Amino acid sequence: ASRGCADDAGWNDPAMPLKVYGNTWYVGTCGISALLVTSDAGHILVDAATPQAGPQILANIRALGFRPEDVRAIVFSHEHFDHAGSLAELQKATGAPVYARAPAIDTLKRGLPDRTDPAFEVAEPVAPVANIVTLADDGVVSVGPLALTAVASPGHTPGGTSWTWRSCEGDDCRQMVYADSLTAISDDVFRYSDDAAHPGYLAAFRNTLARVAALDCDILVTPHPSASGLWNRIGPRAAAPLMDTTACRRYAQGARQRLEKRLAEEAATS
Ligand SMILES: [Ca+2]
Ligand SMILES: [Ca+2]
Ligand SMILES: [Zn+2]
Ligand SMILES: [Zn+2]
Incomplete structure (x- = not known):
């Protein structure tokens, strides 16, 4: 019997892919999520894990009997290297556009963030993404019968987004939520409390928290699976x-x- 994944698993430690619910499948690693939402008209890939993960994600898609060439849209949580790292690799393999909100686009084109990212100084460099479709803050990504709805989730990063959709097993339908990371972490310089340096940023984080709290959710998944106890479920x-x-x-x-x-x-330090 397989032993399964640890809660403190390395971000690159391989996971055997397996159904979450209905047409939503887990194709990520033991430490970093990626999901495939499937239909007979094409698929949607959700997240790209770490710049090293392109091959595991592609292998996992194929392990389930799906073709990367049948992916018609790629979406992601936020523009840190541990979730956006293999986007360019996956776009080449799939031919699919990447959908991104305005505040993430420059990061995706550079392959590095700027100082608007709380974690700017600890960023690892990524491959740029060549074909990006700008996504409205409440936009819907549609592929055949599939419809994924964006919920703008700034705070952990400027460009973060949560995603929600319905998956069914027969007549038993679930609201799936892939909620973005909500951790208030940073590099050694950034201060969330320094509003003058980033006006409105922390207020937007608080607003994101209230919006996520209010979502209709049946099944929650998070970019770091341990943040929602996925491997206990x-x-x-x-x-x-x-x-x-x-x-x-x-x-x-x-x-x-x-x-x-x-x-x-922050209040305790100068
Ligand atoms: Ca319901
Ligand atoms: Ca997370
Ligand atoms: Zn992050
Ligand atoms: Zn992360």
């Missing part, structure tokens, strides 16, 4: 229900607590 170590309609609310509430802890840490 699917795979060999599963011991808790996959569906939990309180998950988004608890996720955002915990994130708010941690954000306020970060603000207390």
Whole structure:
């Protein structure tokens, strides 16, 4: 029997791919999520993991019997190297456009962020993405019968987005939420409390927390699977229900607590 994935798994440690629910499949690594949402008209790939992950994601898509060439749209959570790292590689393999909100586009074209990213100084360089479609902050990405709805989630980064859609097993349909990271982490310079350096940024983070908390959610997944306890819910170590309609609310509430802890840490230092 396979032993499954650890909660502190390396970002590049391989995961056997497996159904989340209905036509939503997990194709990421043990430490970093990626999802494939499938239809007989084509597929949507959600996230690209770490600049090293192109081949594992492609192998996992094929392991499930899907063709990368049948992917018609790529979306992602946020423009850090551990989630956007293999976007260019995946666009070449699929021929699919990458959808991105305005505040992520320059980062995707450069392959590095600028100082608007809290984690600017610890960024690793990425391959630029050649074909980007600018996504409105409440935009819908449609491929055949598939429809993924964007929820703009700035805070962890300027360009972060959460995604939501419905997947069905027969007549039993679930609202899936791939909620962006909500951790208030940074490099050694950035201060969330320095509004003059980034006006409105922290207010936008608080707004993101409230919006995520309010989403209709049946099944939550997060870019770092441990942030939503994914490996306690699917795979060999599963011991808790996959569906939990309180998950988004608890996720955002915990994130708010941690954000306020970060603000207390900033108040304590010069
Ligand atoms: Ca419902
Ligand atoms: Ca996360
Ligand atoms: Zn990040
Ligand atoms: Zn991350």
